[PDB]
RNA sequence: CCUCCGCAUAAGCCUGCGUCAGAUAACAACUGACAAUUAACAGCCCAAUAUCUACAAUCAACCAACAAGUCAUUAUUACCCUCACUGUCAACCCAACACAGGCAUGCUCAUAAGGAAAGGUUAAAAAAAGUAAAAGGAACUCGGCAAAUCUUACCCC
RNA sequence: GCUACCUAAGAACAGCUAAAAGAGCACACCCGUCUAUGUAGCAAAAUAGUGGGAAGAUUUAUAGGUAGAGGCGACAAACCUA
RNA sequence: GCUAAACCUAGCCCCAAACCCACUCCACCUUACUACCAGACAACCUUAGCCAAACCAUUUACCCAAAUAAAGUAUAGGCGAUA
């Protein structure tokens, strides 16, 4: 967008300041093990995580992950943006809270068919603003209900009474540099081979090519 | 016939009639510049 | 001959050029005098190159790589001039005892404002020339009232200022417990 | 200014209240209403 | 700059600052408790504890400081959120943004005790300055920090147009008592037999 | 419109501070202080009125008589004009004559 | 009508003022004999340019050099550091007087010297 | 600004009356 | 020198000499097509062609054939928010015709992480297809 | 299709439709940035003392006058060098406006230059400016005002 | 700096008659006789046509002078910055 | 529902106390802000008037050196207003 600046004449010097923009979540992810059709690196990542915080355990992590999932979805239902910020990353906040605005949402944790299970653990390098971040992946397989109502309170799709089997790979991350940092949801895997969700009861069209006044 | 066009600009006549030097030569002109700086007007002369 | 108006072509198209610290007036004092005479032209060439660069940048509608470089050379040359002025002034005060190196005197104009009238260079004396005699270095009695009025203006200004700052002190001391 | 009236709004809106149902600019304006409301009374 | 200028988070001269504070703006000023530079004991990079406001009951490292508004901006503490992406078609990626903090709202921290301890402002026996802790006295050093002018005084290299340190420090001055122009004249070797005549001055 | 939508800030009035608790003290000093000082010299104020009562033109003539020499030119001009207007008003204009 | 705030310049006046005003350029010669101008190499200034060969000073200073406190030069300092050695050695070895002060270095009267100091003829 | 708060209080009461008339509670 | 009184001369006397000159100059690219030998400079109002010629011959050591001068007017038409006239500083321009065969030509000057994270997330972003129907794509159900 | 206009100099204002971007009768004459008019043209002058200067112009020859006219040097002294500085743009100035008004000079006297009376439609009244008119030809009218035509004689001041 | 008058040195007046002209016809030019339009007008005095003069007591550019108990005035009690 | 409406600061006024002002880089009395030449060029003057007197003509407070009082007395005055 620099050509318009040149042509207008809004010349400016580069951003010069001793201050630095501090964040708490790296954009994207480091490594995503592709799911199947249905190691030493993880061990080293676990050892680094332990070195940074000796008080850590892998066996209890799935339980707290499940708890974070359910509480974050309840906070979505209630519109608890503050709790959701505290327990979710700034990369995960937008894609989660952008489209749900101007409408409500419902989510209930019925039960968990299979227990949540870790898949991989990754660790960051020293060349992140002189900081580091640790990531974990966890498969979760449960049954829940969802039903959205738009601005006017009418159902978009989904039913609150009938749950549906669901399987996902949740990604958590934490800032190991600060003491206040905690694990928070970052992104998802959404593998291609996974099936599509239920469509919407409403029908839809799309516009064709806007034929500039010349046949094609 | 038609008025309003009285001011025919001439810079030499302008500065001779209302120049710093004339106002400093006339004693009252000194009082002119004094009242003018007193009020704080920017241009003391024309 | 003419390329010295430009930096190294290596620097062309570069957004950030290396630049060292500016000159220190203490350092220039410590240095010799002909060294300063040479450094003056060095800084001249540098500043000309920088001005050409910034003007071409304004023409091409872009920013310059290192603007602080300009102010660096500027205050360097300023420190040089200051040091030389200090040397020559100390010399003048040792020899004669004059501080300004340009003759003048406090004189009362027609407006009553006393001013440090400086002297120009003339060939013939003031009692023979006719232009200088017309400057009329004196004030008349009717100026007294106007002087009183400017004094009143200055007094009102100072009083307004001091009353303002007193009221400010009062309000914030009231607001804060201390 | 040291003393200024603040309740003009209320002390005129009572008249306008009594003149609400009138027609034209009388119901809205005051000086057109005062001459009429006293007449109505 | 105009009188009663507002020193916001952005610095003077920036595009955002000149958009927020044009030359014609005349808003209410800001009231701050007087704080002499000698009484000032808050420098950047120092550990600071917060105990009120949002995210109260924590500590962190100062990102920077504004002496005008008596503000201190700390890393990752008292942070709201803002978008930075183009809102035209893209939603706008979120990022946390810090808020400033007052010197009365914040308290320094002891390095070894890492607790909030108020301060006294003394002169050590060797001078020239010392900042000391509360009931149990600990000498608090100053934080270390990259100046803005020189990016690195240690990892610095002398460029071509940069002069060497030995040449810069070496002096060749001679109190010859003579004038610069005369010195340069005999340095050139030139001469001028003509004598400057007197002239009047008035 | 003159009314304001929001309330103003509440006026804090510390009915017990230095001068409100000290008010009026040393006013009978002349009566029960064996007459060393009268309350007229006690008050703080201008010099053309320290224990004096008077209307507009009285005050004007008094202040030009007393502190008129120290006055600015414009102020003294406005004051002379004021005494002139007040003289001619009080003496020529009004009822009761 | 006419504008006052704009500063007076050669552009504004008639041909005569346009010719006589001048835009700050200083004199170089004079004009006589039917508008025949004549400059003089004397009044023409002469820039004094030394050679830069064997010249290692550079316009920029490296940050490695340490800070040095201010030392504003002054007459007493210069005299006590430059002339005091000669004065004291001549005192404690030979004999002198207020006379013969030009030996130690002093201009009793400024005239007869090229570089006058008050008023100074030279510039900068 | 027209100083005083009695009129502002009176008008706040008028305003809340209008607000209740406009969106009365159940 | 600028802002400096010269010593008055009368015939039969010494010659004026400058040691620390104050005059500064700016080469500039032109807008009008000048020939190859011609150069242009932006300079103050006090300088003149002869002393600029000596300046070039001495300081930069380049042969000078001829010089012309011109004065440009800064437009005082601009107005601030106070309706006050804003004037751009006037400036003199010098046109130097070079010596035998220099043939000068103004060369070209300008021919040729947070942002990493930004573009990373931007290219990671996927546009909401229309068949979704404005639904949040985060949920699995 | 018009040009009773134009070009330039002077006087006058001072960057005021040149390049780039913008939103904003129509939206460039509006804003931000960029560049600009280069002296030979015209201004910017004359060392002193004393001294000289009867005889217009009108194609200046004759004639012819009256209002009696715009121009010259000389002897002496002293006199080295040199062309620097300034204006150079525009659709422009005075009239509150992009005002049918006013404006000196040289050339062009119908233009080689410069311009556009109509936003589109219908062709009602009344109104303005023109064109044509049967027979009569001032009978209108305070008055041959106006228009048309090319005409005589007499009174008052 | 409009206007009345004056001062210094300047400029303009085609062509056709008479061939001398404070003469005639008539451009440019100056003025404003009559009619109509316009009347918040294009215009705080104009437009269109018609008219008087147009080598002189002419018109006009430039700078200067005459300042209110006054100036100037081919006295219209005119003009002297609408 | 728009147009709008609302704010509290800037600062200012009255007093008191205290006496106050000037780049010293360049330029500025010629046509001010302009680097540089033979002139003999210099100020010391009651204020008046409006108004009041129901007209107006003598006259009609306006300070020049302690606040109060004497005293609005002695006095003056078309012996009137008034001072
Ligand atoms: Mg006017
Ligand atoms: Mg005229
Ligand atoms: Mg209403
Ligand atoms: Mg004006
Ligand atoms: Mg030129
Ligand atoms: Mg010439
Ligand atoms: Mg031209
Ligand atoms: Mg005319
Ligand atoms: Mg054409
Ligand atoms: Mg048209
Ligand atoms: Mg039409
Ligand atoms: Mg007929
Ligand atoms: Mg008949
Ligand atoms: Mg009849
Ligand atoms: Mg009849
Ligand atoms: Mg009749
Ligand atoms: Mg006349
Ligand atoms: Mg003729
Ligand atoms: Mg005739
Ligand atoms: Mg008539
Ligand atoms: Mg007729
Ligand atoms: Mg005629
Ligand atoms: Mg005639
Ligand atoms: Mg008569
Ligand atoms: Mg009469
Ligand atoms: Mg009288």
Structural domains of chain I sorted by starting position, each given as residue range(s) with its CATH number in brackets: 1-141 (3.30.70.330)
Strands (E), chain F: none
Tokens of H9: 């209080």
- Expressed in Å, this structure's resolution amounts to 4.0
Residue E128, preceding bond cis, omega within 30 degrees?
yes
Helix (H, G, I), strand (E, B) or coil at A45: helix
DSSP string, chain C: --GGGS--GGGTT-S-----BPP-HHHHHHS-SHHHHHHHHHHHHHHHHHHHHHHHHHHTT---S-THHHHHHHHHHHHHHHHHHHHHHHHHHHHT--SSSS-EEEEE-TTS-EEEEE--EESS-TTT-STGGGG-----TTHHHHHHHHHHHHHHHHHHHHHHHHHHHHHHHHHS--
Select from E2, E23, E87, E196 the residue whose CB has the most chain I CBs within 10 Å, as the one to mutate to test that interface.
Answer: E196
Spell out the domains of chain B, with CATH numbers in brackets. Answer: 4-46 (1.10.287.3980)
Q: Quick check: A36 and A194 in contact, CB under 8 A?
A: no
Q: Which nucleotide is nearest to F69 (CA to C1')?
A: L64
Q: How far apart are CA F78 and CA F75, in angstroms?
A: 5
Q: Domain extents for chain F? A: 1-96
3-state SS record for B1-46? CCCCCCCCCCHHHHHHHCCHHHHHHCHHHHHHHHHHHHHCCCCCCC
Chain B window 1-40, residues with Cβ within 7 A of nucleic strand J: 2, 4-12, 14
Q: How far apart are CA A112 and CA A144, in angstroms?
A: 9
* Bridge partners for I117 per DSSP: none
| β-pair type (I26-27, G60-61) | unpaired
Tokens of E136: 């149990």
Of B7, B14, B2, B10, nearest to B46 by C-alpha is B14
Q: How far apart are CA I134 and CA A100, in angstroms?
A: 9
Tokens of A86: 């505290």
Do B and E have ≥3 inter-chain CB pairs under 8 A? no
Of F39, F40, F19, F42, nearest to F28 by C-alpha is F39
Tokens of A44: 């080293």
> Cβ neighbours of residue E149 under 8 Å, at least 6 residues apart?
C21, C68
Q: How far apart are CA E179 and CA I17, in angstroms?
A: 14
CB atoms within 10 A of CB F52: 12
Tokens of E36: 């002499």
Chain F within 8 Å of D9 (Cβ-Cβ)?
yes
Chain I within 8 Å of G49 (Cβ-Cβ)?
yes
> Cβ neighbours of residue I124 under 8 Å, at least 6 residues apart?
A27, A28
Helix (H, G, I), strand (E, B) or coil at I31: coil
Of E94, E95, E96, nearest to E73 by C-alpha is E96
Chain C window 68-127, residues with Cβ within 7 A of nucleic strand L: 99-100, 102, 104, 109-110, 113-116, 118, 120-124, 127
What experiment produced this structure? Answer: cryo-EM
Helix (H, G, I), strand (E, B) or coil at I98: strand
Helix (H, G, I), strand (E, B) or coil at G8: coil
Of I128, I120, I114, I136, nearest to A95 by C-alpha is I136
- HSE toward the beta carbon, residue I65, CA cutoff 13 A: 12
Spell out the domains of chain A, with CATH numbers in brackets. Answer: 1-189 (3.10.450.240)
Spatial strand order of the sheet with I91-98 comes to I26-27, I38-43, I91-98, I64-72
Name residues with Cβ closer than 5 Å to ligand 4, which is an ion: G 1
Helix or strand (DSSP H, E) at I55: helix I49-55
| Amino acid G73 CA to nucleotide L13 C1' distance, rounded Å | 52
- What ligand is nearest to the CA atom of residue G19? 5
Contact (CB<8Å) C19/E202: no
**In terms of CA atoms, which chain A residue is nearest residue E59?**
A180
């Amino acid at each position: 967008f620099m050509q318009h600046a040149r042509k207008a004449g809004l010349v400016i010097p580069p951003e010069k300041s001793d201050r630095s923009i501090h964040l708490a979540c790296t954009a994207g992810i480091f490594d995503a093990y592709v799911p199947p059709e249905g190691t030493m690196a993880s061990q080293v990542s676990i050892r680094r995580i332990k070195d940074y915080d000796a008080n850590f355990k892998i066996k209890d992590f799935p339980e707290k992950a499940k708890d974070i999932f359910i509480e974050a979805h309840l906070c979505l239902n209630n519109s608890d943006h503050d709790r959701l910020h505290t327990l979710v990353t700034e990369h995960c906040f937008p894609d989660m809270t952008w489209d749900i605005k101007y409408k409500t949402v419902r989510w209930s944790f019925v039960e968990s068919l299979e227990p949540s299970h870790v898949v991989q653990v990754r660790c960051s390098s020293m060349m992140n603003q002189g900081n580091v971040y640790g990531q974990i992946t966890v498969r979760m397989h449960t049954r829940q209900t969802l039903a959205i109502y738009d601005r006017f309170g009418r159902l978009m799709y989904g039913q609150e009474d009938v749950p549906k089997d669901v399987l996902e790979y949740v990604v958590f991350e934490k800032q190991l540099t600060n003491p206040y940092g905690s694990w928070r949801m970052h992104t998802k895997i959404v593998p291609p081979w996974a099936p599509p969700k239920q469509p919407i009861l409403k029908t839809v069209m799309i516009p064709g090519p806007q034929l500039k006044p010349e046949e094609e | 016939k038609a008025r309003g066009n009285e001011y025919q600009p001439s810079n030499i006549k302008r500065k001779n009639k209302h120049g710093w030097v004339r106002r400093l030569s006339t004693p009252a002109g000194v009082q002119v510049i004094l009242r003018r700086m007193l009020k704080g007007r920017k241009s003391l002369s024309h | 001959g003419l390329e010295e108006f430009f930096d190294d072509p290596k620097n062309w198209g570069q957004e950030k050029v290396k630049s060292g610290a500016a000159w220190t007036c203490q350092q220039l004092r410590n240095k010799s005098n002909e060294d300063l005479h040479k450094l003056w032209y060095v800084l001249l060439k540098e500043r000309n190159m920088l001005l050409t660069l910034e003007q071409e940048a304004k023409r091409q509608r872009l920013p310059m790589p290192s603007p602080e470089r300009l102010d660096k050379v500027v205050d360097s040359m300023d420190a040089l001039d200051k040091v030389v002025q200090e040397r020559e002034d100390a010399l003048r005060l040792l020899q004669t005892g004059q501080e300004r190196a340009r003759p003048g005197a406090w004189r009362r104009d027609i407006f009553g404002r006393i001013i440090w009238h400086k002297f120009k260079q003339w060939v013939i004396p003031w009692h023979l020339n006719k232009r200088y005699n017309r400057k009329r270095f004196f004030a008349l009695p009717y100026v007294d009232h106007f002087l009183r009025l400017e004094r009143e203006k200055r007094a009102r200004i100072k009083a307004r200022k001091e009353n303002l700052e007193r009221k400010k002190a009062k309000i914030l001391l009231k607001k804060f417990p201390h | 200014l040291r003393n200024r009236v603040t309740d003009r709004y209320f002390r005129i809106q009572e008249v306008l209240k009594h003149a609400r149902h009138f027609r034209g600019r009388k119901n809205r304006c005051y000086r057109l209403a005062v001459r009429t409301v006293i007449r109505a009374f | 700059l105009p009188p009663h200028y507002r020193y916001g988070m952005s610095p003077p001269g920036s595009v955002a600052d000149k958009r927020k504070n044009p030359p014609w703006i005349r808003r209410r000023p800001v009231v701050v408790e007087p704080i002499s530079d000698e009484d000032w004991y808050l420098f950047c990079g120092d550990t600071v504890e917060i105990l009120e406001g949002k995210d109260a009951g924590k500590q962190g490292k100062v990102v920077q400081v504004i002496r005008q508004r008596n503000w201190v901006v700390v890393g990752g503490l008292n942070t709201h959120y803002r978008y930075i992406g183009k809102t035209m078609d893209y939603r706008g990626t979120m990022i946390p943004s810090e808020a400033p903090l007052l010197h009365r709202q914040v308290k320094l921290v002891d390095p070894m005790d890492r607790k909030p301890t108020e301060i006294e402002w003394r002169f050590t026996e060797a001078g020239e300055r010392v900042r000391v802790s509360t009931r149990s006295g600990r000498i608090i050093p100053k934080p270390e920090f990259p100046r803005a002018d020189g990016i690195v005084p240690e990892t610095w290299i002398d460029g071509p147009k940069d002069t060497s340190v030995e040449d810069a420090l070496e002096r060749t001055y001679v109190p010859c008592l003579k004038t610069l122009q005369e010195e340069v004249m005999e340095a050139m070797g030139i001469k001028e037999t003509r004598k400057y005549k007197k002239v009047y001055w008035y | 419109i003159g009314i304001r939508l929001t309330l103003p800030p509440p006026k804090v009035v510390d009915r017990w501070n230095e001068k409100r608790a000290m008010f009026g003290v040393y006013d009978n000093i002349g009566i029960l202080g064996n007459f060393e000082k009268h309350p007229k010299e006690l008050i703080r104020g201008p010099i053309w009125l320290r224990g004096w009562k008077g209307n507009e033109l009285q005050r004007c003539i008094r202040k030009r008589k007393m502190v008129g020499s120290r006055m600015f030119a414009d102020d003294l001009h406005n004051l002379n004009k004021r005494i002139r207007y007040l003289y001619k008003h009080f003496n020529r204009h009004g009822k009761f004559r | 009508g006419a504008d006052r705030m704009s500063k007076w310049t050669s552009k504004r006046g008639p041909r005569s003022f346009r010719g006589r005003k001048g835009r700050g350029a200083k004199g170089i010669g004079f004009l006589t004999s039917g508008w025949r101008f004549v400059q003089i190499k004397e009044m023409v200034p002469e820039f004094v340019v030394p050679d830069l060969t064997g010249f290692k000073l550079k316009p920029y200073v490296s940050y490695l050099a340490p800070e040095s406190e201010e030392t504003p030069l002054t007459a007493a300092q210069l005299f006590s550091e430059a002339v005091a050695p000669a004065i004291e050695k001549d005192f404690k070895d030979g004999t002198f007087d207020p006379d013969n002060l030009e030996k130690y270095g002093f201009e009793p009267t400024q005239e007869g010297k090229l570089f006058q100091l008050y008023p100074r003829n030279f510039l900068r | 600004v027209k100083k005083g708060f009695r009129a502002a209080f009176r008008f706040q009461k008028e305003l809340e009356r209008q607000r209740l008339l406009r969106c009365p509670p159940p | 020198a600028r802002n400096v009184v010269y010593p008055l001369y009368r015939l039969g006397g010494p010659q004026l000499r400058v040691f620390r000159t104050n005059f500064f100059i700016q080469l500039v690219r032109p807008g009008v097509a000048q020939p190859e030998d011609t150069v242009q400079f932006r300079i103050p109002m006090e300088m003149t062609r002869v002393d600029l010629r000596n300046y070039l011959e001495g300081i930069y050591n380049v042969p000078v054939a001829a010089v012309r001068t011109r004065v440009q007017h800064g437009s005082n038409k601009r107005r601030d928010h106070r309706n006050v006239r804003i004037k751009k500083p006037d400036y003199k321009v010098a046109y130097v015709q070079l010596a035998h065969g220099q043939t000068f030509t103004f060369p070209d000057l300008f021919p040729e992480d947070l942002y990493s994270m930004l573009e990373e997330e931007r290219q990671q972003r996927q546009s909401s297809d229309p068949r979704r129907g404005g639904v949040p794509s985060w949920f699995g159900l």
